[PDB]
Amino acid sequence: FVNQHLCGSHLVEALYLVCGERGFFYTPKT
C-alpha cells in the first residue's frame, strides 16, 4: 500500500499551515 506517499501529501499540508510566511523545504528522502 502507498502509505508513505499518501502520508507525505498530508505532511506538506501541515507544514504549509504551521510554517506560514516562512515556508518550508520538503525533502522526502534525506
Partner 1 sequence: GIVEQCCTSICSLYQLENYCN
Residue labelled with grid coordinates 501529501: 9
Told to check if 29 binds ligand Oc1cccc(O)c1 by CB under 6 A, we report no
**From CA 23, how far away is CA 20, in angstroms rounded?**
6
Contact in structure between 30 and 11 (CB atoms under 8 Å) = no
The residue within the footprint of ligand Oc1cccc(O)c1, chosen from 1, 4, 10, 25 (CB under 6 A), is 10
Q: Fill in the per-residue mask, 3 to 22: x = in contact with its own copies (CB under 8 A), - = not in contact.
A: x-xxxxxx-xxxxxxxxxxx
Residues of this chain that bind partner 1 (CB under 8 A)? 1-5, 7-8, 11, 14-15, 17-20, 22-30
